[PDB]
Amino acid sequence: AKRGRKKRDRKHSKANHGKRPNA
Amino acid sequence: TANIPNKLTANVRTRTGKGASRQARRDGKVPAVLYGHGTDPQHLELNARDFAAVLRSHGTNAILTLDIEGTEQLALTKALDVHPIRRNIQHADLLVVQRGEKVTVEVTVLVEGDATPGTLVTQDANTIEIEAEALSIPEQLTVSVEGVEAGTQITAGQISLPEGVNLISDPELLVVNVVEAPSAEALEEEGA
Amino acid sequence: MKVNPSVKPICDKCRVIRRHGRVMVICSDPRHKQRQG
Amino acid sequence: SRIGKQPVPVPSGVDVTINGQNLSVKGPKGTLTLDVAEPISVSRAEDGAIVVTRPDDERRSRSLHGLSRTLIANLVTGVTEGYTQKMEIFGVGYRVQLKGQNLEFALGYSHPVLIEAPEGITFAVESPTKFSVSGIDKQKVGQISAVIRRLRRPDPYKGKGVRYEGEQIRRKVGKT
Amino acid sequence: MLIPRKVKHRKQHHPEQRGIASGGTSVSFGDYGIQALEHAYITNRQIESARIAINRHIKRGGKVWINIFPDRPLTKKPAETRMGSGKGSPEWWVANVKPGRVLFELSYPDEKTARDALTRAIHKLPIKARIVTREE
Amino acid sequence: MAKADKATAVADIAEQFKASTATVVTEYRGLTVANLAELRRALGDSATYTVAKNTLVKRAASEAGIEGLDELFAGPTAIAFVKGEAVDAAKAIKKFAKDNKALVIKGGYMDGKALSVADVEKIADL
Amino acid sequence: LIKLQIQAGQANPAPPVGPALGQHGVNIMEFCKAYNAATESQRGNVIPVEITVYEDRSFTFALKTPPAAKLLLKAAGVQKGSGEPHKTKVAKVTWDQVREIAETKKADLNANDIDAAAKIIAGTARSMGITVE
RNA sequence: GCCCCUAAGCGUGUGCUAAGUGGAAAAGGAUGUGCAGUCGCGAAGACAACCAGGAGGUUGGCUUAGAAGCAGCCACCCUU
RNA sequence: ACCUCGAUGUCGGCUCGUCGCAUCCUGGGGCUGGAGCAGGUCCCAAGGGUUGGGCUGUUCGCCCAUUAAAGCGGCACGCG
Ligand SMILES: [Mg+2]
Ligand SMILES: [Mg+2]
Ligand SMILES: [Mg+2]
Ligand SMILES: [Mg+2]
Ligand SMILES: [Mg+2]
Ligand SMILES: [Mg+2]
Ligand SMILES: [Mg+2]
Ligand SMILES: [Mg+2]
Ligand SMILES: [Mg+2]
Ligand SMILES: [Mg+2]
Ligand SMILES: [Mg+2]
Ligand SMILES: [Mg+2]
Ligand SMILES: [Mg+2]
Ligand SMILES: [Mg+2]
Ligand SMILES: [Mg+2]
Ligand SMILES: [Mg+2]
Ligand SMILES: [Mg+2]
Ligand SMILES: [Mg+2]
Ligand SMILES: [Mg+2]
Ligand SMILES: [Mg+2]
Ligand SMILES: [Mg+2]
Ligand SMILES: [Mg+2]
Ligand SMILES: [Mg+2]
Ligand SMILES: [Mg+2]
Ligand SMILES: [Mg+2]
Ligand SMILES: [Mg+2]
Ligand SMILES: [Mg+2]
Ligand SMILES: [Mg+2]
Ligand SMILES: [Mg+2]
Ligand SMILES: [Mg+2]
Ligand SMILES: [Mg+2]
Ligand SMILES: [Mg+2]
Ligand SMILES: [Mg+2]
Ligand SMILES: [Mg+2]
Ligand SMILES: [Mg+2]
Ligand SMILES: [Mg+2]
Ligand SMILES: [Mg+2]
Ligand SMILES: [Zn+2]
């Protein structure tokens, strides 16, 4: 589940503000 | 047995609210309110550290001498709103009191001494209500256990109550019950 | 020598240290030697 | 801390040399050199001592204080009295002899083994069971002693091998 | 196991698991207790294991109060089945726990043994808890 | 440990000295518990046997003119004391001193005056 | 420096005194001939002892203790007692016979009076789990 | 967002981190380190290291061969 | 039910490989209720090696004779 975790966590960047499409 | 009032400082809360209370609580201060027959609910910030220190030294039930901007008042802790988790005191209630004034209060009861070994002593009511003067309030009173016979109950009416204090609770409120220590084949037989 | 996530002083002759970045418990008893991993 | 707080005695026959943070000690047994840590300070107390002092109580200097103190003490004692280790053998047929300046062990291997004493270290057997290792350096004597000690597996059953002098091996007995 | 004798409705929604425990946050029956710090579903399996753990550790005489009851049923639809065809049949029981609620309470003479039995119980629970004493 | 028992024991030793005339002081380290049993068999029938901290009784040695034994705190002290005539305990100190030769007579305190280790046999025979 | 206790009707048994001495370089039957003199004074008492056998086979045994339950047998005639104390107050021992028995009980003690010895008798009996009367 | 790629700060002041943590994760383990809060003793000399001991009643009574203090029960006794 | 139904050929075997290590053998160890011989368990280690048959469509599996050993897996359950 590395791909899912690592895609899902890049929403927590400063430029995304804790949100991103498809979580 | 007069108890010397404890001397805190307090100052009138400029403006009220949850934001103001949170800020004051953040600066190491406790929001509180004076009331009583002083007929003026007066909103007072007081030092959190000193409040906790005096509550440690003299329990929940202790007279204070509040210095409100120079005016000198006698107060008694009525209630403390405390957080369930962070355990910090959030709010305090202060009845105004003066000498020679009976007041109803709740005093903790701490069982003292060792019991007879074959059985365990267990308290159901840790607090007993008493009527007593402002200065003569006992912060705690003891109940005797010294090698009781087989399991028996104890109620508020047979306690060595202090002088100048009066029981309020109905005398048949159980406080400490000696119950026989569960055997090996009795302890794990309850709970499912 | 155990290699487990949790290391504890099994007996009172054991003692816990940090050696080379690892928490270890070291005793005079060879059986109690034990480190984190 | 407290150990790093007292100065090191220097005897009336042993002369010291300080340059920069480097120093050397010279005595009857030989000579030695040593380097002292950076934040620590080393001073020649002319009243007969070498004072090691930490400027502050930060954990690094708090740590290097006693370290440097013990290094200087070991340097001086090694140059004055030297460092010697007594070490014994146990078992039947486990024997020790000499060959030149080297010391030879016959401990039940199908071949003999023998150790060449490196620089500043002199082996000296006093009995086929008892031998000693001596040197000007405390660390070298201990290291070569440990190297000797581990020429056999530990023996908790019969104890046979190379033990230290004052060492009490642990021993568990198999049921047969 | 702790099972209610009957519930009026046997298929409820999942208990809302937010907020701080408002009711039941004090130690009242015994002198030492285990007091929670995280939201969870404490099933009767966890409760039974923890109670047996405390009883095994103290093993002599002392009162254990399980002042939480598992009376809320979580259902589970049978395996290998697709979505749909209605809600499943209830097959485990739960207490809804908030951060703040005293879960287990103990009365025992000494201190260290009581603390150790309480932490032995804590290890069997799906949450972080702490040992809390009868006094402020 | 607090100042309370410090002071109470200071008073204890000071007051037990007051009513005793036989005062021979000694250093004893190195004799077994059963050996002290033998000594209190042979001496406890007349005396009491105590020890004092080399510091706590520095000021406990000031109420009388017992200021003269502060300078003999070199070696953990201990005293056997008889309340009667001074002549009793001096024999038993030698009786319990000969059997090891490792119990030293730290000195004496006679007529309320402090004396070295040499002059205990000077007065003990007399 | 050791101690032993021997029953008055046993013949060098292996359970109680098997490893009692063999590791200390002590004899057996010669120790029997030594310790029978002191065991057989009373003819009706099992005897304990403080044993001190020197490294070179010179046993120097001296009495230490009297037996406790076995002499309560002779004190009351009671056969034995229930192993669980503090509920059966079915045992009674008096003080005047203690004054009788002190002069054979005070022989090896370290007090300066009789209060201490009479009181340690009382304390031993109270430690058995009963009172003294 | 501002060392170079790559536009703009190897910005200033005070602190923290030694893990390349920053630049993934749980129950749980842990003398890492900084700060704050109380508590026990402590120059009448305490914690460590160093020595003399650690006794008399007295191997307390339980099923067994010995429970003696070190399987498993009953709990917390005097003399120096 | 997210791409593919104006076509992404579907099991096993063959040929040929390639990578991981969660190690089957060989190599280095710590603890043992490890005397030795031989083991048990954990740790480190991926360089090379890792058989031929009977039964069955077989994978799986059962067995036969060996072997230092006859490892487990990913690659469109690799490879038409
Ligand atoms: Mg997963
Ligand atoms: Mg979503
Ligand atoms: Mg474990
Ligand atoms: Mg809702
Ligand atoms: Mg509540
Ligand atoms: Mg409610
Ligand atoms: Mg847990
Ligand atoms: Mg580019
Ligand atoms: Mg640029
Ligand atoms: Mg910037
Ligand atoms: Mg710069
Ligand atoms: Mg910068
Ligand atoms: Mg900076
Ligand atoms: Mg990391
Ligand atoms: Mg990283
Ligand atoms: Mg993490
Ligand atoms: Mg922990
Ligand atoms: Mg920290
Ligand atoms: Mg036993
Ligand atoms: Mg859809
Ligand atoms: Mg498409
Ligand atoms: Mg298609
Ligand atoms: Mg096409
Ligand atoms: Mg095509
Ligand atoms: Mg196409
Ligand atoms: Mg391939
Ligand atoms: Mg590996
Ligand atoms: Mg491998
Ligand atoms: Mg191997
Ligand atoms: Mg191995
Ligand atoms: Mg290579
Ligand atoms: Mg076929
Ligand atoms: Mg493959
Ligand atoms: Mg395929
Ligand atoms: Mg494949
Ligand atoms: Mg194909
Ligand atoms: Mg084809
Ligand atoms: Zn250990």
Coordinates of C-alpha atoms (C1' of nucleotides) in Angstrom, one line a residue, chain I residues 16-68:
Chain I
rC16 C1' 15.2 -18.4 -21.5
rG17 C1' 15.7 -15.7 -17.8
rU18 C1' 15.6 -11.5 -14.2
rC19 C1' 15.1 -9.4 -9.1
rG20 C1' 13.8 -9.6 -3.5
rC21 C1' 15.3 -12.0 1.0
rA22 C1' 10.9 -13.4 4.5
rU23 C1' 18.2 -18.3 4.1
rC24 C1' 17.2 -24.5 1.8
rC25 C1' 22.9 -25.5 1.4
rU26 C1' 27.6 -23.3 2.0
rG27 C1' 30.0 -18.7 5.4
rG28 C1' 30.1 -15.5 10.6
rG29 C1' 27.9 -15.5 15.4
rG30 C1' 24.8 -14.7 20.7
rC31 C1' 21.6 -17.7 24.2
rU32 C1' 20.7 -22.9 25.5
rG33 C1' 16.9 -27.2 29.6
rG34 C1' 24.8 -26.6 24.7
rA35 C1' 29.6 -32.5 28.1
rG36 C1' 31.1 -34.5 22.9
rC37 C1' 28.4 -36.2 18.5
rA38 C1' 24.1 -33.9 17.0
rG39 C1' 20.5 -30.1 17.8
rG40 C1' 16.7 -26.0 19.4
rU41 C1' 16.0 -20.4 18.8
rC42 C1' 17.5 -15.8 17.4
rC43 C1' 20.9 -12.4 14.8
rC44 C1' 24.3 -11.2 10.2
rA45 C1' 25.0 -12.7 5.5
rA46 C1' 21.8 -13.1 -1.6
rG47 C1' 28.6 -15.0 -4.2
rG48 C1' 27.6 -19.5 -6.2
rG49 C1' 24.6 -23.9 -5.9
rU50 C1' 19.7 -25.8 -5.2
rU51 C1' 19.0 -34.0 -8.8
rG52 C1' 16.7 -37.7 -11.6
rG53 C1' 12.1 -40.8 -11.6
rG54 C1' 6.7 -43.5 -10.4
rC55 C1' 1.5 -42.1 -9.7
rU56 C1' -1.8 -37.9 -11.8
rG57 C1' -3.8 -33.3 -17.3
rU58 C1' -1.9 -31.8 -13.4
rU59 C1' -0.3 -26.9 -10.0
rC60 C1' -0.9 -28.9 -5.5
rG61 C1' 0.3 -33.5 -3.6
rC62 C1' 1.6 -38.8 -2.5
rC63 C1' 5.8 -41.8 -2.9
rC64 C1' 11.1 -44.1 -4.9
rA65 C1' 16.6 -43.5 -5.0
rU66 C1' 19.8 -39.9 -3.9
rU67 C1' 22.1 -35.0 -2.3
rA68 C1' 25.8 -30.2 1.1

